Amino acid sequence: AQSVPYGVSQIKAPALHSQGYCGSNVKVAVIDSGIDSSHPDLKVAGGASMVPSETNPFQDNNSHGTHVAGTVAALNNSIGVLGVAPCASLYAVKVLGADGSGQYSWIINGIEWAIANNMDVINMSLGGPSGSAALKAAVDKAVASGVVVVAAAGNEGTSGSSSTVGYPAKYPSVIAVGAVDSSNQRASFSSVGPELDVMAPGVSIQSTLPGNKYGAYSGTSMASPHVAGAAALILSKHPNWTNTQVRSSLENTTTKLGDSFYYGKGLINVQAAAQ
Ligand SMILES: [Ca+2]
Ligand SMILES: [Ca+2]
Incomplete structure (x- = not known):
């Protein structure tokens, strides 16, 4: 039988599904460790590998990319x-190796790939403590090209009064996503700062794993795909909205939580955001 992970319901995705909005014809790129295309609960449309030693984007030796991808678009059927x-049309853009590490050049190449291939939405459940002119240029170009760019805020918790949001989430053109639990409480690991935009479920998130498995992961990496997925639903309802409109709608219709330094605008609500 098919189970609906708490997080999907928490964001009010099912209300849209009931209406016939499920992200059809929206191209979402998961920029991560690849996606196991053999998983029965996933449909991968395409993709690319930027990792020189791992040329098949459809082999996920890490498991994270498959897990994020399931949050975005695990199929609606009688399993998993x-x-x-x-x-949604799911694309595996592999930029991390089996060890879950990757070079910046690989990540940037994958963003460039996404722009060139007309992705509507980019999900980056990755983060580093430092940026680069090239990383900023790529995200900025994607946004100027009409792409909705979504990133995990980072898992750095608090640090005195400083922003612990990583890059690329830290850039203004990127939507930065922090994590809440099922009670709407901020996860202790969730990064904080003025650059935090929205919150999504990121604790004990059940999703697909390689080899026809399912399991729970925690992190802002798990929170981000809920927003990427939400952007895809809005685009399925309002195909002519710009990335700007999608972003503003998501940020403006949140359920407000605590201070914006810790929760940004609050918890997304796709039902309200979809109008
Ligand atoms: Ca399913
Ligand atoms: Ca940002």
Whole structure:
């Protein structure tokens, strides 16, 4: 039987599904460790590998990319779980190796790939403590080209009064996503700062794993795909909205939580955001 992970319901995705909005024809790129295309609960449309020693983007030796991808778009059927945008066209852009590490050049190449291939939405469940002119240039170009760019804020918790948001989330053009639990409380690991935009479920998130498995992961990496997926639903309802409109709608219709330094605008609500 199919289970709906708490997080999907928490963001109010199912209300849209009921309406016939499931992200059809929206191209979402998961820029991560690849996606196991053999998983029965996933449909991968395409992709690319930027990792020189791992040329198949459809082999995920890490497991994270498959897990993020399931949050975005696990199929609606009689097995496994359910994605936020179960009809989205899913792309594996492999930029991390089996060890879950990657060079910046690989990440940037993958963003460039996404722009060139007309992705509507980019999900980056990755982060580093430092940026670069090239990393900023790529995200900025994607946004100027009409792409919704979503990133995990980072898992650095608090640091006195400083921003612990990593890059690329830290850049203004990117939506930065922090993590809450099922009670709407901020996860202790969730990065903080003025650059935090929105919150999404990121604790004990059930999703797909390689080899026809399912399991729970925690992190802002798990929170981000809920927003990427939410962007895909909105785009399925309002195909002519610009990335700017999608972003503003998500940020403006949140359920407000605590201070913006810790929760940004609050918890997304796709039902409200979809109008
Ligand atoms: Ca399923
Ligand atoms: Ca940002």
